[PDB]
Structures are given as C-alpha cells and as structure tokens.
Amino acid sequence: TIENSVPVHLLRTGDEFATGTFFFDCKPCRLTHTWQTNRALGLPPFLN
Amino acid sequence: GVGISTGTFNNQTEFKFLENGWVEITANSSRLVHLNMPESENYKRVVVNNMDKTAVKGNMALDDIHVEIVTPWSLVDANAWGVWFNPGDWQLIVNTMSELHLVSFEQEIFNVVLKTVSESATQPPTKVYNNDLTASLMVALDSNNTMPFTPAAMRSETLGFYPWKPTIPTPWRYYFQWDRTLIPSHTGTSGTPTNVYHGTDPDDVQFYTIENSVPVHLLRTGDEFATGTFFFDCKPCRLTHTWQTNRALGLPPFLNSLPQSEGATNFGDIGVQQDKRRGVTQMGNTDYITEATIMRPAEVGYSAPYYSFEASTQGPFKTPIAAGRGGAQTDENQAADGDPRYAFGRQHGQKTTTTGETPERFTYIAHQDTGRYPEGDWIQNINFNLPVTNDNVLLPTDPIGGKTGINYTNIFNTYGPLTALNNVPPVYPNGQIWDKEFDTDLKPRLHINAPFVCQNNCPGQLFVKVAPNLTNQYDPDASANMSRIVTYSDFWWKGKLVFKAKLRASHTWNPIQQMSINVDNQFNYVPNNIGAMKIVYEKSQLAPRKLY
Amino acid sequence: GFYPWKPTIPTPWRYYFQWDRTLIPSHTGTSGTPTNVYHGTDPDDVQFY
Numbered sequence: 001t002i003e004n005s006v007p008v009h010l011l012r013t014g015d016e017f018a019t020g021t022f023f024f025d026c027k028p029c030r031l032t033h034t035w036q037t038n039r040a041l042g043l044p045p046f047l048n
Numbered sequence: 049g050v051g052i053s054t055g056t057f058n059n060q061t062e063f064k065f066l067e068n069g070w071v072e073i074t075a076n077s078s079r080l081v082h083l084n085m086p087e088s089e090n091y092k093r094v095v096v097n098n099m100d101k102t103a104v105k106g107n108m109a110l111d112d113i114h115v116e117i118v119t120p121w122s123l124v125d126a127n128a129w130g131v132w133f134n135p136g137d138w139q140l141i142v143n144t145m146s147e148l149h150l151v152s153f154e155q156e157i158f159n160v161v162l163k164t165v166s167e168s169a170t171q172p173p174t175k176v177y178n179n180d181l182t183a184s185l186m187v188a189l190d191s192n193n194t195m196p197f198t199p200a201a202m203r204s205e206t207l208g209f210y211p212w213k214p215t216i217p218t219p220w221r222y223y224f225q226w227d228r229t230l231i232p233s234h235t236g237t238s239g240t241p242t243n244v245y246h247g248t249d250p251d252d253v254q255f256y257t258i259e260n261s262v263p264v265h266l267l268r269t270g271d272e273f274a275t276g277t278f279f280f281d282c283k284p285c286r287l288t289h290t291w292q293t294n295r296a297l298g299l300p301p302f303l304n305s306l307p308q309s310e311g312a313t314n315f316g317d318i319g320v321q322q323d324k325r326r327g328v329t330q331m332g333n334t335d336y337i338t339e340a341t342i343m344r345p346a347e348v349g350y351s352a353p354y355y356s357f358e359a360s361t362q363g364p365f366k367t368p369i370a371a372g373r374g375g376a377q378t379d380e381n382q383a384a385d386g387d388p389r390y391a392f393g394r395q396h397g398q399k400t401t402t403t404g405e406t407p408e409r410f411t412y413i414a415h416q417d418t419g420r421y422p423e424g425d426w427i428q429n430i431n432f433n434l435p436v437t438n439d440n441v442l443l444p445t446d447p448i449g450g451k452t453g454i455n456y457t458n459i460f461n462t463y464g465p466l467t468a469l470n471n472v473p474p475v476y477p478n479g480q481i482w483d484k485e486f487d488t489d490l491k492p493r494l495h496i497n498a499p500f501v502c503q504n505n506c507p508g509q510l511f512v513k514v515a516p517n518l519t520n521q522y523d524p525d526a527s528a529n530m531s532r533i534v535t536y537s538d539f540w541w542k543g544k545l546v547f548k549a550k551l552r553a554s555h556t557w558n559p560i561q562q563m564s565i566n567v568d569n570q571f572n573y574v575p576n577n578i579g580a581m582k583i584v585y586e587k588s589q590l591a592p593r594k595l596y
Numbered sequence: 597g598f599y600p601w602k603p604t605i606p607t608p609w610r611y612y613f614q615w616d617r618t619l620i621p622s623h624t625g626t627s628g629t630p631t632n633v634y635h636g637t638d639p640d641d642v643q644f645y
C-alpha cells in the first residue's frame with residue numbers, strides 16, 4: 001500500500017516537484033560485437 | 049657501428065631465497081635466432097577447403113576449412129616452459145616449491161647480422177655468402193596489444209629447447225572471418241548432407257597491418273633493441289594436487305568393530321544398519337545413509353558431454369573440459385575429463401637424431417583427482433525403491449536415442465553452483481605459460497592451455513621481419529615481384545622470465561612423491577655418442593594437498 | 597548434548613585415507629557378475645597425519 005509505505009506530496013497548480021539527482025552504480029556497456037567463435041582463435045596452420 | 053658487440057649471452061637459472069620461505073627465480077634464455085627473407089612482401093588472404101574429407105559422410109571432426117591472412121612478418125614466441133627451464137631446474141621447482149608466481153618478462157635482441165647470397169653459376173655451380181652491412185631488420189612490438197593473439201605453442205612453433213642449438217621464428221598469420229555450414233553424417237546417412245563456405249560477413253572484416261598500426265624499428269649491426277620490463281597481473285599457480293573426491297570428505301563412520309589381527313582381508317565393520325544409521329542425507333525418501341548417499345558439502349569437478357562437438361557460424365568445434373583423473377591407473381577415460389595431447393618434433397622434444405617427419409607425443413595425465421569414470425554412474429527413480437529395477441534406472445550401458453554407442457553419460461552435464469574445481473597444471477616442456485584473456489564481459493573461470501592468464505595486462509607480440517633489399521631494376525608499376533637481393537639475417541635473442549615462489553614444508557609422516565633418476569630415466573636426460581638430445585614430458589603437481 | 601543439565605561425550609577421531617575402487621551399476625536383471633573391486637591406494641595420495 002502506497003498510502004501506508006511512502007511520503008505523499010499534494011501539488012496544486014502553483015506547486016511543482018523534483019526528484020533530486022540519483023547516481024547509478026553500473027558496469028559500462030560496450031558498443032562492439034565479437035565475431036569470433038572457436039575456429040577463429042589463435043595461430044592458424046602454416047600453409048606450405 | 050659494425051665492430052663492436054651489442055649484447056651478452058646468458059642461459060642461467062638463478063634462485064634467490066628471501067625471507068619467510070619465498071624464492072625469487074629468474075630464468076634467462078638467450079637463443080640465437082635465424083630468419084630468411086619473406087617470399088612475398090605482400091599480404092595475402094587465403095581460404096582453406098578440404099571438402100574432400102568432409103564428404104566421406106563419416107568425417108566431420110576433420111574440417112580444416114578456415115580463413116587466414118598471411119603476413120610477410122615473421123613472429124617470435126617464447127611462451128613455453130621448455131624454453132626456460134631444463135629437466136634439472138624443473139626438478140627443483142616441482143620438488144621443493146608449493147606455489148609459483150609469474151612476475152617479470154623482458155626480451156632483448158642483439159648482434160644483428162645480415163648476409164647476401166651470391167650464386168656463382170660456375171661448374172657446381174658455387175655459393176658465395178657476403179655481408180650487407182647497410183641492410184636492415186624490421187623489429188616491431190605490439191606493446192598496445194592491438195593485433196590478434198597467436199600463441200605459437202599450440203602448434204609447437206616456439207623456440208628451440210636446447211640453447212646450444214640455433215632456432216627459427218614462425219611466419220605470422222591470423223584469422224579472417226570465414227562463414228560456413230556443415231551438417232553431420234554417419235557412414236549410412238543417405239544422400240549428400242550439407243556443407244558450404246559462403247564467404248565472409250561484411251561486418252566482421254578486420255584486416256590488420258603491422259606497418260600501419262605499430263612503431264617499427266630498423267636495426268643495423270651496430271644497433272640493438274630492448275623491450276623494457278613488463279609486469280604481469282596473475283593469481284598464483286599451485287604445485288599441489290587434490291586427491292579427494294566426495295567419498296573422502298568429512299567425518300568417516302565410527303567402526304564399532306575392528307580387526308584383531310593382520311590381513312588385507314580383515315575389515316573393520318561399522319556394526320549398524322543402513323536404515324538405522326544417524327547423520328544427514330540429501331534425500332527425504334530413504335532412511336539409508338551410505339558413503340554414496342550421505343550429504344557432502346558440495347561436488348568436486350563436474351560431468352559434461354563427451355565428444356560434444358558443437359558448432360556455430362565458423363563451423364563445428366569440440367567442447368573443452370577442465371578435468372583431472374577419475375579412475376584406477378591405466379583405467380581412465382582419456383576424453384571424459386579432457387587429457388591434453390601434445391605433438392612436437394626435433395626442436396621441442398623428440399630425439400634430435402630422428403628420421404622422417406612424424407611428430408611424437410604424450411597424453412599428459414595429471415595427479416589431481418576431480419575427473420570421472422562415466423562408466424559407474426546412474427540415474428534412477430525418485431521412488432528409490434531398490435534394489436533398483438531396470439525400468440527404474442538409466443545406466444551407462446543403456447543406449448539413448450536408440451543408437452548403441454551413445455549414452456546419457458555422453459549427453460550428461462552435471463555442473464552445479466556446487467562444483468569445486470582446480471585449474472590446469474603446467475605441462476612441461478611443450479605446454480604454454482601465460483595466455484591473454486577473452487574480451488567478453490563474461491569470462492572463462494580458467495584456461496585449458498595455460499596456468500597463468502593475464503587479465504588487465506600482457507606483454508605484447510614481437511614481430512621480426514627482414515627489410516626489402518632492392519636491385520637496380522624495380523618498377524612499382526609492374527606486378528611481377530620486386531625481385532630483390534636474396535637476403536637473410538641472423539640475430540641473438542635473450543630472455544629474462546621472473547618467477548617468485550614459496551617452499552614446501554612437510555606435515556605428514558609418509559614421504560611425498562618426488563622426481564628422480566631411475567635406471568630407466570638416465571639416458572633420457574643425456575646426449576649420446578652422436579649428440580642426440582631430447583626433452584621428455586614430466587608431471588608437474590606431484591605433492592598432496594588437503595582439499596578440506 | 598543439546599540439554600545443558602545433561603552430561604555429553606566427544607567423538608572418537610577418525611579421517612579418510614585414499615582408497616581406490618571401481619564399481620559398475622547393475623539392475624536386478626543385468627546378467628553376469630558386473631564389476632567392483634578395491635585395488636588399494638595410490639601411493640601419491642598418501643597423507644598419514
């Protein structure tokens with residue numbers, strides 16, 4: 001129950017509300033993709 | 049410049065004991081490398097089809113189709129054990145230390161020599177070797193690890209394990225995105241299955257170039273080059289093996305009855321019933337508390353599919369396994385707990401004075417016991433109600449999928465958040481030392497080819513090449529091929545690898561398994577009348593360690 | 597003992613020693629004698645505390 005478990009704000013026209021700034025905790029997101037399997041790993045054979 | 053020497057030779061193994069049982073080992077390997085002129089001074093892109101072995105409808109693990117790009121650049125790998133220690137040093141480490149910490153690594157190249165070959169077509173004809181004192185060598189270092197990583201241990205394209213023996217770098221090459229499809233097929237599967245090489249995904253096209261992406265150094269005789277010191281980041285390597293399963297964990301039963309005399313047939317009997325024994329089990333059905341039933345804190349090692357030849361966009365590939373042993377001696381599943389296999393020749397083991405061209409190998413079998421005998425398991429009913437009945441138990445012998453050869457053992461994967469594990473021990477010589485780490489957000493717990501993985505930073509690849517020596521005729525407006533002066537160059541390479549370890553104390557009463565020289569070993573560690581040398585493989589972790 | 601006003605007893609100490617074995621499953625029907633033996637001990641894994 002929201003009424004029971006959280007502070008409620010009544011805003012009228014003249015009012016306004018603002019959350020402050022929240023900082024997240026998260027590992028970065030990469031904008032790259034891996035195209036390597038198990039057959040594209042290491043030193044390929046030597047072509048005689 | 050050209051008179052004078054640039055470096056010194058040192059292939060010495062130094063051990064410096066510190067305080068509180070810590071030693072600081074520094075292995076030096078100064079080998080003299082030889083290198084010839086790259087045939088093409090151009091980069092290639094070659095495709096390999098062997099669509100004549102992958103048609104026999106039986107042959108699917110023999111898929112040698114990949115795509116590589118050849119580089120005129122010749123690489124140099126020293127990421128091996130055999131290249132550092134000798135059978136006499138390894139004994140010291142392995143018999144007396146208990147853990148190893150890889151530290152520093154620094155390479156140094158000196159006494160560069162470049163000679164031209166003059167072919168005097170006269171009778172024989174004859175060959176006249178000279179020195180082109182103005183010639184050059186193109187040394188390069190990928191200090192910012194920008195290029196792929198090709199550990200040349202995998203394919204025994206390392207450096208000689210005998211210092212007094214001149215060696216050769218490996219022609220550099222790397223992978224290029226090759227796309228394929230190949231469906232399995234036994235000897236009977238009717239029709240033509242499916243297998244093709246579409247080509248390349250335009251997305252995954254990475255065409256590297258050393259000239260473009262790395263600072264190149266030209267060294268003349270008078271010059272020299274030195275990498276500085278690189279520090280690794282790696283968890284220590286243990287020189288101990290675990291011999292404890294799930295039946296050798298905790299407080300054994302209390303034997304109400306003990307033998308009253310000698311005989312390997314006088315067993316101490318507990319003296320209580322299985323369905324009236326006190327303790328804890330992970331069952332809510334039974335009342336039977338057995339050495340197989342009782343609840344153990346966790347599970348040692350895991351059980352995975354064998355010969356689970358998976359596949360993706362590049363083609364089928366086997367499923368790795370981190371295993372130890374798992375059976376009576378010469379009573380193992382060589383493939384169930386994944387036992388490495390090593391093939392080298394002449395320059396990395398094997399009898400120097402051999403003939404023909406056939407690699408020699410060994411199937412290294414550790415000492416740790418985390419492996420399994422997938423030939424003594426079973427899946428039965430929640431009803432238990434033993435003695436278990438056929439229709440109530442799936443055994444190894446019982447086929448799955450209707451085919452004989454197959455099992456549930458073959459398709460089985462018991463890896464739980466309760467799986468305990470020990471990394472892959474060093475396999476010396478041959479075996480690898482340290483191996484880069486995957487750039488995937490999620491990373492493998494441990495590598496199967498090397499005990500040390502450097503995470504945040506690894507030393508860069510040393511690419512060694514010969515500079516084009518040109519004649520009086522050269523038209524860059526001619527395909528031909530920059531006919532050049534047949535040039536090669538010989539240079540001395542030196543290495544300083546640093547390891548820091550701790551010493552083993554005794555805690556038992558029974559001696560521990562050590563390394564020695566038998567009447568069977570002797571001549572495996574000494575040259576012969578002709579000078580036939582060779583380096584045998586030898587178990588690393590041979591010393592107990594209590595798991596729990 | 598879980599009852600304080602009740603005198604208790606320690607447990608005779610004992611621990612494991614490397615024992616090597618083989619045992620293959622077998623239902624009530626599996627024909628013949630399957631396989632099960634106790635070779636002994638691997639000389640490598642001998643810890644006598």
